[PDB]
């Protein structure tokens, strides 16, 4: 049945700030996107130039 | 002389598709015949074959394989389609030559 199904352990890949199953990812989100977005943003500048 | 056996068993480990956990027949290139064979597969043996592939793909995209433990062993490879296929071909060959008559 669907009760015997669980999302496996993704610790192996999780970013440092969302590895503890007891801390709101929400706060350390703004950062996780800021970075990835930063790279992209930069990449644009690069291209631009 | 087990020569032939000792060889097949080799080439098998050589091809190493079994490292992806795929069965011999799993690798067959899907031609008009195979295509028909596959359509004849009982639903279990089929959804199974599929997953085996969707897993192989997932691997190939990750650039990995199965831990040696889960590799497919030569003697345990199940030619799940070989017979179905053969028949298909047989049927055809009969239809084919019968239209030359």
């Amino acid at each position: 049945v669907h009760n015997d199904v669980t999302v496996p352990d993704f610790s192996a890949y999780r970013r440092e700030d969302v590895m503890d199953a007891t801390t709101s990812s929400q706060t350390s989100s703004e950062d996780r996107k800021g970075f990835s977005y930063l790279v992209t943003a930069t990449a644009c500048v690069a291209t631009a130039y | 002389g087990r020569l032939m056996d000792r060889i097949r068993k080799w080439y098998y480990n050589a091809a190493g598709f079994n490292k992806y956990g795929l069965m011999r027949d799993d690798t067959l290139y899907e031609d008009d015949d195979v295509k028909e064979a596959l359509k004849r597969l009982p639903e279990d043996l089929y959804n199974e074959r599929m997953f085996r592939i969707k897993r192989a793909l997932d691997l190939s995209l990750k650039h990995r394989i199965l831990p040696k433990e889960q590799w497919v062993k030569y003697e345990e490879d199940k030619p799940y389609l070989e017979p179905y296929l053969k028949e298909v071909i047989r049927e055809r060959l009969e239809r084919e030559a019968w239209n030359k008559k």
Partner: protein, 295 residues
């Protein structure tokens, strides 16, 4: 929803089926249940609610009479706080092309009973509303998504929802449609969300409000319903929130607010996705993700 939960909250407790594992039900012992009762079923956490022709004081009396709990230490008086559950924007795809229709559920982390925002959120959820084949309104409905839903035979049904919890929440939507439209559907949906966080009008909220007020009332239609509300008001919100109150909080909400609030919780957030059935058509979280900004 269980699957949705099972990935939206993965790893923590919330991500569990209220019915539990197959093994636990197969092995649970007289004891373990015995304990569950003792460990959890305790006076400070329990609430006797009643509605209808009943004298408050009379009630409280029979209460004192059979609910005779004695509390020595401070322990039996303390309500154990719960280890907050971690949200994890991600997905879970259970596929079975051999099923009639595919079901899809998407959601963002919710605030939790406490937050006065929940109000706004519900107002929003009233704008996108819910639809389903039998509604006679059809092509005319006032819910944007409902309209298109009809116009292009998008879904068999779709529904907004803001399941709240003590510390968290699951704001999102669930629709069921034919294997071959899942996409277009989702698309229009996620669009509405976007439109919510970007161009909601005064006329849009005005209605929702009036719609919400009604359900607000319809939740209190009879005895059981009221009692439930109370049973749950005290248990989650602390006290009892009267309709007169709820209403103020609603007449408060306006456009600007909805935008800010939905943006606050929906814009560019990694969401949770739950797919079940013949879902081939809808694909890539990346793509679904991208549908979270601009609208």
């Amino acid at each position: 929803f269980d699957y949705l939960h099972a990935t939206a909250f993965q790893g923590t407790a919330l991500a569990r089926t209220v019915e539990g594992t197959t093994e636990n039900i197969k092995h649970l012992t007289r004891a373990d249940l015995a304990s569950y009762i003792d460990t959890h079923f305790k006076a400070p956490r329990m609430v006797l609610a009643a509605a209808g022709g009943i004298s408050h004081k009379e009630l409280v009396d029979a209460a004192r009479q059979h609910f005779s709990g004695v509390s020595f230490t401070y322990k039996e008086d303390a309500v154990p706080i719960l280890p907050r559950c971690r949200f994890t924007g991600s997905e879970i795809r259970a596929r079975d092309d051999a099923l009639p229709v595919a079901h899809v559920a998407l959601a963002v982390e919710g605030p939790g009973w406490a937050d006065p925002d929940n109000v706004v959120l519900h107002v929003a959820n009233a704008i996108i509303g819910r639809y389903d084949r039998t509604f006679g309104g059809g092509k005319h409905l006032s819910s944007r998504l409902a309209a298109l839903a009809v116009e292009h035979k998008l879904c068999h049904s779709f529904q907004t929802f803001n399941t709240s919890y003590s510390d968290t929440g699951l704001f999102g939507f669930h629709f069921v449609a034919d294997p071959l439209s899942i996409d277009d559907m989702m698309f229009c949906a996620q669009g509405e969300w976007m439109r919510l966080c970007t161009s909601t009008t005064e006329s849009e909220v005005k209605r929702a409000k009036n719609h919400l007020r009604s359900a607000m009332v319809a939740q209190l239609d009879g005895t059981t319903p009221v009692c439930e509300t109370i049973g749950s008001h005290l248990l989650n919100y602390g006290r009892r929130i009267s309709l007169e109150e709820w209403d103020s909080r609603i007449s408060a909400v306006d456009a600007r607010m909805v935008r800010d609030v939905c943006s606050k919780y929906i814009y560019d957030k990694c969401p949770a996705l739950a797919a079940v059935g013949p879902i081939e058509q809808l694909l890539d979280y990346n793509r679904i993700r991208s549908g979270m900004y601009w609208i």
